[PDB]
Amino acid sequence: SSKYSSNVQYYGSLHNTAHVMLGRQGDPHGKFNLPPGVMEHFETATRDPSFFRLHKYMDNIFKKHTDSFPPYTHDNLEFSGMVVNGVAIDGELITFFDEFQYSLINAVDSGENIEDVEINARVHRLNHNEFTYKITMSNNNDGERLATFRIFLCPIEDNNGITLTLDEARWFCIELDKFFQKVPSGPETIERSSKDSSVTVPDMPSFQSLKEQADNAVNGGHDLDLSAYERSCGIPDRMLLPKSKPEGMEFNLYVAVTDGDKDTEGHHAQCGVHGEAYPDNRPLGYPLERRIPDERVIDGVSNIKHVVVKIVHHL
Amino acid sequence: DALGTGNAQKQQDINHLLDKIYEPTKYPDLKDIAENFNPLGDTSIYNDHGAAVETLMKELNDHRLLEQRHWYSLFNTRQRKEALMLFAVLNQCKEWYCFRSNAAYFRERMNEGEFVYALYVSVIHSKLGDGIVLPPLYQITPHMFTNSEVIDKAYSAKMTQKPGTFNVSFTGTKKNREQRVAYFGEDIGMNIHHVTWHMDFPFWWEDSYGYHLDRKGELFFWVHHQLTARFDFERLSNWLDPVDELHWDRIIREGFAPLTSYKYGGEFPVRPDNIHFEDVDGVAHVHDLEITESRIHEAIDHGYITDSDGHTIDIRQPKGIELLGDIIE
Numbered sequence: 001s002s003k004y005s006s007n008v009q010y011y012g013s014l015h016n017t018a019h020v021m022l023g024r025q026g027d028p029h030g031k032f033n034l035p036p037g038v039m040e041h042f043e044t045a046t047r048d049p050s051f052f053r054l055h056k057y058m059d060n061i062f063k064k065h066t067d068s069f070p071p072y073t074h075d076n077l078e079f080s081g082m083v084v085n086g087v088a089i090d091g092e093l094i095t096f097f098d099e100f101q102y103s104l105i106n107a108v109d110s111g112e113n114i115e116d117v118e119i120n121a122r123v124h125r126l127n128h129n130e131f132t133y134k135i136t137m138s139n140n141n142d143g144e145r146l147a148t149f150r151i152f153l154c155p156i157e158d159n160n161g162i163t164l165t166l167d168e169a170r171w172f173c174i175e176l177d178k179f180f181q182k183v184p185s186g187p188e189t190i191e192r193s194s195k196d197s198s199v200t201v202p203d204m205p206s207f208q209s210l211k212e213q214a215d216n217a218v219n220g221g222h223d224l225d226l227s228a229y230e231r232s233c234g235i236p237d238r239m240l241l242p243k244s245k246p247e248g249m250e251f252n253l254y255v256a257v258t259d260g261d262k263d264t265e266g267h268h269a270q271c272g273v274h275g276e277a278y279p280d281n282r283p284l285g286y287p288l289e290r291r292i293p294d295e296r297v298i299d300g301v302s303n304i305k306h307v308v309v310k311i312v313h314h315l
Numbered sequence: 316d317a318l319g320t321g322n323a324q325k326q327q328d329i330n331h332l333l334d335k336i337y338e339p340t341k342y343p344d345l346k347d348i349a350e351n352f353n354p355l356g357d358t359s360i361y362n363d364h365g366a367a368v369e370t371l372m373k374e375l376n377d378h379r380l381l382e383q384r385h386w387y388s389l390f391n392t393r394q395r396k397e398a399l400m401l402f403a404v405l406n407q408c409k410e411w412y413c414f415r416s417n418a419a420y421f422r423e424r425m426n427e428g429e430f431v432y433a434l435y436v437s438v439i440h441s442k443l444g445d446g447i448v449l450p451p452l453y454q455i456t457p458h459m460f461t462n463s464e465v466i467d468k469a470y471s472a473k474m475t476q477k478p479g480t481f482n483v484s485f486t487g488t489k490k491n492r493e494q495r496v497a498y499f500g501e502d503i504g505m506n507i508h509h510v511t512w513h514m515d516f517p518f519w520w521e522d523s524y525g526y527h528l529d530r531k532g533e534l535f536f537w538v539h540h541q542l543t544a545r546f547d548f549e550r551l552s553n554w555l556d557p558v559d560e561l562h563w564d565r566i567i568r569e570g571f572a573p574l575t576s577y578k579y580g581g582e583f584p585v586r587p588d589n590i591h592f593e594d595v596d597g598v599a600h601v602h603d604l605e606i607t608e609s610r611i612h613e614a615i616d617h618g619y620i621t622d623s624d625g626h627t628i629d630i631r632q633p634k635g636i637e638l639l640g641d642i643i644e
């Protein structure tokens with residue numbers, strides 16, 4: 001419930017109340033006067049497990065609506081002319097555990113004339129290895145068409161072992177990349193990087209380090225062009241792929257390529273932080289956002305292809 | 316017989332006896348015996364002067380014994396008593412002439428399970444059954460060991476007289492449970508041992524039957540600790556966690572549907588999952604267990620088991636664990 005609500009006096013605010021409501025579960029009449037809790041804050045909610053129990057519930061309130069549409073037609077997904085020939089991963093899907101260090105200084109009080117001792121915290125975070133997409137593919141059209149390269153990584157079996165369905169699994173898939181490129185009039189072979197993903201963001205510069213740097217261009221004339229960081233909406237590059245098992249799991253990779261001219265049929269525009277119209281017009285999760293009752297179909301549009309990949313975890 | 320022994324005789328006799336068991340025998344000697352014999356005319360074959368025979372007749376007479384083609388559990392205090400009367404005749408035979416006679420005479424008018432059950436225990440414990448190997452339960456009475464589907468497939472084979480082997484399944488919705496560690500419980504081998512183990516050392520044995528089984532007591536302690544470990548390991552290998560101990564005050568969290576059927580009897584009932592234990596009429600009260608479990612648990616805790624007189628019999632010593640098993644199973 002944000003202010004674009006049409007009736008806030010009636011529909012209230014499920015989500016946000018649901019954050020305060022899960023937080024004082026520690027003290028609802030407030031007999032102890034404990035402070036607010038991990039869920040009543042954004043830099044800390046993902047910590048508490050009910051955080052994801054609470055968004056699973058918001059999550060299928062949306063799917064309820066999401067699913068009421070009629071499924072898509074053949075004629076629906078087809079971007080006639082284009083066809084994915086093949087999909088390949090140039091490298092290895094390997095994820096491991098790196099090490100990071102951020103600084104504990106603003107945390108301890110130092111008053112004055114007392115001097116600063118550099119204290120640091122070291123954490124353990126996930127990582128993967130750069131890899132490249134080699135998407136081989138022919139534009140049968142007469143000539144050069146704009147393209148939306150959409151890439152989802154959906155799962156395959158259950159954890160019961162079961163092996164779900166692109167209906168059972170269409171919803172579970174996470175987006176790995178979305179980009180716009182022009183396609184030549186004939187068999188190109190587009191290759192693209194772990195590193196250029198559109199949903200990702202690099203780790204950011206240190207506090208200090210941006211002090212060092214700020215300072216140096218003050219006594220020096222002028223610049224700071226580190227535009228690299230004035231928005232950064234995405235998730236951590238480290239989190240690009242999932243962790244998986246050390247034995248390895250085979251995920252399913254979906255590259256569906258839709259038609260750029262109608263997509264951007266009108267217009268960063270990634271983090272539209274300042275008013276900037278989001279550029280893709282397809283709805284979001286396209287085209288996996290709709291019930292897909294007979295796979296029979298996703299399967300026979302030339303511009304959708306799925307290939308299996310396999311990720312491995314280094315201990 | 317050879318108006319006796321052999322073993323490829325004793326043996327033959329047995330195979331004839333447990334052949335098509337849900338139907339009157341087809342081996343003619345088994346039948347004139349079946350007809351002609353009188354377990355009561357030469358009490359001499361009998362080391363009891365035939366008090367055992369004389370007791371079964373009495374019941375077969377007032378026809379107060381369980382009917383044929385009906386089911387049977389060894390947990391029924393009467394069915395058991397009837398099955399075990401057959402064991403006491405077959406038991407006091409001086410030779411094959413008395414065994415074949417009786418398991419022929421009886422086979423033909425006592426129920427099948429009492430019968431299957433008596434013939435086996437008797438063969439296992441009685442003096443007279445050395446040479447023999449018993450056929451595997453799984454093939455003599457397949458309904459206790461094969462599925463419900465294969466059973467129906469076999470019924471059709473038969474209706475139509477076209478043969479063949481069917482491949483059996485595994486229980487629930489594999490990839491949905493812990494019918495993932497099924498291969499273990501459902502094996503015809505373990506099921507065989509489980510039954511044998513308790514035919515070798517039965518809970519009902521009295522030392523009047525002839526000898527004393529030695530440490531059934533620890534032997535009970537141990538055999539089950541083994542299946543419980545052996546089981547706990549298989550659940551390790553399946554990403555499953557060691558098993559919950561059951562309590563009477565809690566829900567039976569994990570229920571199953573067995574999909575198995577009796578031959579005469581109906582399908583095995585099923586159990587719904589997250590159920591509350593009910594007091595079962597006829598058997599015993601749920602609390603009846605809860606107190607039993609405390610009387611138990613106080614003998615362990617005290618250091619002594621107390622008998623009927625109020626004698627305290629000490630158990631903090633090596634025979635310990637066997638007097639505990641005699642009170643616990």
Ligand SMILES: *[C@H]1O[C@H](CO)[C@@H](O[C@@H]2O[C@H](CO)[C@@H](O)[C@H](O)[C@H]2NC(C)=O)[C@H](O)[C@H]1NC(C)=O
Nearest residue numbers: 464465468469472478479480481482483484485
């Ligand atoms: C039951 O599983 C068995 C495995 O023993 C299958 O029997 C096989 O029949 C197939 C026909 O596809 C042969 O290729 C194999 O040689 C068979 N083996 C015996 C290794 O017969 C059987 O297919 C299963 N089903 C019936 C759906 O019997």
